[PDB]
Amino acid sequence: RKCVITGKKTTAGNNRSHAMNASKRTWGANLQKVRILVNGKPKKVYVSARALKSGKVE
Amino acid sequence: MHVKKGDKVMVISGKDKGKQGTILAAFPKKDRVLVEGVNMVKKHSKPTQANPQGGISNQEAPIHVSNVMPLDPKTGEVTRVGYKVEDGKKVRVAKKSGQVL
Amino acid sequence: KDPRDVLKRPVITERSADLMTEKKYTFEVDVRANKTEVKDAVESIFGVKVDKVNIMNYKGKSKRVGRYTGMTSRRRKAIVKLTADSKEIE
Amino acid sequence: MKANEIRDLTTAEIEQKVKSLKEELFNLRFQLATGQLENTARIREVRKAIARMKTVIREREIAAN
RNA sequence: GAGCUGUAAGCAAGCUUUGAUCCGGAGAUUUCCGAAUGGGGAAACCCACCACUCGUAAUGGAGUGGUAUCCAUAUCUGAAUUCAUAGGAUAUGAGAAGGCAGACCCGGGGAACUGAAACAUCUAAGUACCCGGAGGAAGAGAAAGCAAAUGCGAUUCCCUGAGUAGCGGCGAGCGAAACGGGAUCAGCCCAAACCAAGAGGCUUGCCUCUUGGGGUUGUAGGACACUCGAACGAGGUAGAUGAAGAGGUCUGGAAAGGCCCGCCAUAGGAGGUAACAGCCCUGUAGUCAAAACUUCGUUCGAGUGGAUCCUGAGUACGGCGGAACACGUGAAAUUCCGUCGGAAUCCGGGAGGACCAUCUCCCAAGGCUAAAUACUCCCUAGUGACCGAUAGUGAACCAGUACCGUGAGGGAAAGGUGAAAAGCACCCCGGAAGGGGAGUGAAAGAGAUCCUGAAACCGUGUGCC
RNA sequence: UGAGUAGCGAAAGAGGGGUGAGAAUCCCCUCCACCGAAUGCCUAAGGUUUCCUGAGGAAGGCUCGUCCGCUCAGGGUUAGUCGGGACCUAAGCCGAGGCCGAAAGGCGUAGGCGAUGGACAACAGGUUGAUAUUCCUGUACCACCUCCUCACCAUUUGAGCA
Fold this sequence. Notes:
Chain B: One of the proteins that surrounds the polypeptide exit tunnel on the outside of the subunit. One of two assembly initiator proteins, it binds directly to the 5'-end of the 23S rRNA, where it nucleates assembly of the 50S subunit. Chain B: Belongs to the universal ribosomal protein uL24 family. The structure is cut from a larger assembly and holds chains A, B, C and D. Chain A is mainly beta. Chain A has one helix at about 50-55; strands spanning about 10-15, 20-25, 30-35, 40-50. By secondary structure, chain D is mostly helical. Chain D contains 3 helices and no strands. Chain D has helices at about 5, 10-35, 40-65. In chain D, helix 2 runs antiparallel to helix 3 (about 40-65). The two termini of chain D are about 25 Å apart. The interface between C and D is small, with 8 and 10 residues.
């Protein structure tokens, strides 16, 4: 899972409950599957929601 | 080494002291020098292949080069060695003398 | 490749001496050499006609000396059966 | 020896004298296998000879190249 | 510049001053595996296609060279749907891969034992380990800084600050920075404004894209109108030259030892020389040397004005959930991550440890940047109040071997004749082995674990019982 | 140390000759005994020369050993038809493209690998110390090629080929 325009990728962190207990988790960006111009040719590549917010092509 | 095959030399140490001899051997692999009439070992000899003999062979044995210096060809005493060039090829020139070899 | 290298040396045994009487000859050949280029090599260089060629290869015998345990060379032996009224070999 | 394989003709005559002394070397291996050869230094010098000539030919061709 | 075809003892032989063996520089070959790359595969093999050669009456057979994928460029074609793209086909590419020093540096991922005398917060520790990447150093770097004064001016690193301020079941423990002193010292290039052309859409500049001006700036600056691929020295890789006693005498098997005498020394470093050598040799100090490659040092633009424009947008920042800052959410600044929201434009912004006003400093959201720095698989030359073979590397010796394990892996023991083999001719016993003699040596008790040969242990005669 | 003790690993030999320095243990002969849906004869996996010949007996041989599966020096394995390749594919594995995944990677299309399977042409006599559907002998068979031979077809209302 990658994002083509921006360097968003799944990152690893640690969720902490009450009593401050620490365990390891992961953090996912809001990727979406959609049909995009990357070259002049249409393709379907992933894209983050923050990247799609900034008004790109379809 | 400073000595060569075929040289008239003079020996310093060992049982054989101060006796003349000629050189017919050289061992640069081990700095080892066989002089005539020195280290007179008596080798026990078995028959050699088809040679039908059995006896003690009395023959030369080689000595170390550090115990041998050559002599001055002019004055005859044992002298030290130097190196010098003479019209192309270098020559072995003994010390305290201008003569070569 | 060169035909003067494809067969290395002949081998002289009692079996070999038996087969030269009945006109089959023994040779040690190159490892990569097969049944046919030894044949074309031998009529190219001997002026002889050979009918059948048999091939077999020996692996090295294990052999010990001193304390080392080496392996002798892998060999390929060739048998050449000359035709009738073909010339002889040294 | 060393000079002659350059000083003689360019390529041609080398080839038949190559297989001439390859024939000779072949004869030495044959007679050694049957156990009759005497000059065992020949079996060193002929194969050296070949390298001598091979190298000159090969350099020559790369020098021409 | 003279013996040499290694270890290693060969005579079946042969090469050498018509200059060998050897040493240094550059070349050539280099089978087959191996990223392995024609296809396959159980490493070290098998089976091919095309082009060109050998050979055959041909078939079979042989040689040489290409023939993997991806990526970049170029060309052609460009289905379905024949606008056009996917895709396909051809050619060009000292292009990539894989290995590596178990070191050093960045990132991504990332424990537990342990401590807390239990234990979860914490610690161990962002350690080990795994992954990716390059470098010989890497990162970092020219201020939206440090700081609070007649102020300093890129980073980095060392001493100091200081076990201080702090953090912390305020427990266990963790733990700074700036000022000061040193090493080193390099500062630069874009984007935007505007102009010029060409680049067409036309909705006549709202945008092309490549050049140049256009420029990198905070007591603001810039646009804007006024201003001029050689030759040479030193190294490196082979080397050469290089002083002075067989001095006498004694013991000794052998003098380098003892006594009595000399000499050199820019050389009394060291090693070998039958025992402890400056003058025996190799050498050493100096002094030279390069046909060929290789590494270092000398040649081949500004000031003034300030109408107007620009000064890095889904960016700073905020919420939420985390991470890093010594700092565990706490009075929590600051940096980064993910989601969501989301400005300002010079009268503008950011920081000064909550936050707000004043004051001071600075201009982010664009890049590049050597030296001080870290580290040794290596190579050269040396050094040791480092070991002397149960030590010192596992490995002084054919060791990562033998051996064990299916495999990952584990992993030993084993140095010493003599100065020289001069290593036992010859005789007797015997099948030999082994001995006894003879011989070599200074030693045979020195004869193949062969310097010395302790003890355990085992024998043989015996004085006393 | 035990201690010259335990053990010496299922089994019928005996006698005469011969070698030898040495003989219960080696060799020759005559009887006897044992196995015989096996302790016989082929041949896998596996081992890798242990196979044969000639020497030797320090170590291996639970004793001896003149002996060998030990040492040393030689020698021995021949295939168009046998087994496997240049034939096919199962299970499974790999995998251009691709699809997923913090990274390594995981899955998988076309395709390919993969016998234990399917197809597929020599056999019965002789031969030495060692090989034998491999060597010799006679009779065969399978695939492919044409310097050649005869028979026939049509060389585009085309024979033939697939």
